[PDB]
Paper text:
The first KRAS‐targeted therapeutics are now being tested in clinical trials but the consequences of preferentially targeting the GDP or GTP state of KRAS and the relevance of RAS nanoclustering have remained unclear.
Here we report a Designed Ankyrin Repeat Protein (DARPin) that recognizes the RAS switch I/II region with low nm affinity, independently of the nucleotide bound (GDP‐ or GTP state). This DARPin, termed ‘784_F5’, occupies the effector recognition lobe, resulting in interference with SOS‐mediated activation, RAS downstream effector interactions, and KRAS nanoclustering. Consequently, this anti‐RAS DARPin potently blocks downstream signaling, leading to a strong reduction in proliferation and anchorage‐independent growth in RAS‐dependent cell lines. We showed that the expression of ‘784_F5’, the pan‐RAS, nucleotide‐independent DARPin can lead to tumor regression in a colorectal xenograft model which may hold promise for further investigation and development.
Author numbering:
A (entry chain B): 11 to 174
B (entry chain A): 1 to 176
Write the structure that this text describes.
Amino acid sequence: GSDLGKKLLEAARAGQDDEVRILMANGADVNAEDTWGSTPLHLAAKTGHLEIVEVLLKTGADVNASDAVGHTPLHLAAHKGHLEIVEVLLKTGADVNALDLMGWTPLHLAARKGHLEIVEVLLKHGADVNAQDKFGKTPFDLAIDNGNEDIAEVLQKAAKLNDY
Amino acid sequence: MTEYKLVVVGAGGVGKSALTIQLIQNHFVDEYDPTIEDSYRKQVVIDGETCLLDILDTAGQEEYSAMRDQYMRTGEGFLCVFAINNTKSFEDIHHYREQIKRVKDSEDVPMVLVGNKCDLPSRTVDTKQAQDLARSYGIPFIETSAKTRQGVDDAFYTLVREIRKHKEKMSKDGKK
Ligand SMILES: Nc1nc2c(ncn2[C@@H]2O[C@H](COP(=O)(O)OP(=O)(O)NP(=O)(O)O)[C@@H](O)[C@H]2O)c(=O)[nH]1
Ligand SMILES: [Mg+2]
Ligand SMILES: [Mg+2]
């Protein structure tokens, strides 16, 4: 709802599994938005609450909803390093190459933050190694800039196994 | 519980993200912890009132954007941040303020001028110059350090008070 929508947003951010369930049973709008465009799925994804993410995805949440600064749940989970949330998002239709206002894809965000497993999983789901941000930087470039050498090698190998 | 919609703007690297994250998490982000544009919520008591701060931390940039215009329209008040060791960031303040006034089509938008990085061993921007600018704009000036936490609460709370005054001045209009 808007009453129920506001409650759902706060339950999702706070990791209250039972309260999310009850709110949804009462017809809370699964895609309610807060001031800055976050849905319950955004808030659950970015605070690392896997079980709520799953429940939301099963009850109609828009997996590619985009907030005020162009982040989808997948961007936020990739940034925050929540591997299992990244996986279920991708398994439920998340756009692997969604773009924020900086021109960052999930792969850029994971590469900057040094989340190796999330880089490998994004690559598996067809993340673009040649995507350039507003400053002309690819995920590889950002891995180098942030001293993430393991991720740089993985990215460099991906680019070759793709060139052939 | 009153909600306040706050936006943090200013040039790249001035510490907008560091200021926000200090407020929310009591954590200083250094050069090695990459940040994104993002929103945050904090519940605080300000002058006896329980408040919800919905804060949008935005990147420094010099682009026309429909989405950035949209968040400026939605925002109720703005922290305009420069760094005391970056003269350019101080010179850019004018442009941030002008852009907000243009987009919101208003001469009276709640704002606070924030001079950040006051922990540093020295500076290139004179305090008095920043005070003079804030005075000419009719807005508060707050000196902050995201690193030591000096002024962090003050900057956000003061912005809330500026929004509150604006709303109160509008209700006097709206009956008279
Ligand atoms: N000493 C000191 N360093 C600070 C302070 N605030 C931020 N920094 C440093 O300044 C750099 C940039 O800070 P950051 O918060 O990312 O800046 P920003 O204004 O959010 N940048 P952008 O517009 O790109 O988002 C970082 O290395 C950070 O640690 C401060 O008060 N003191
Ligand atoms: Mg920032
Ligand atoms: Mg918020």
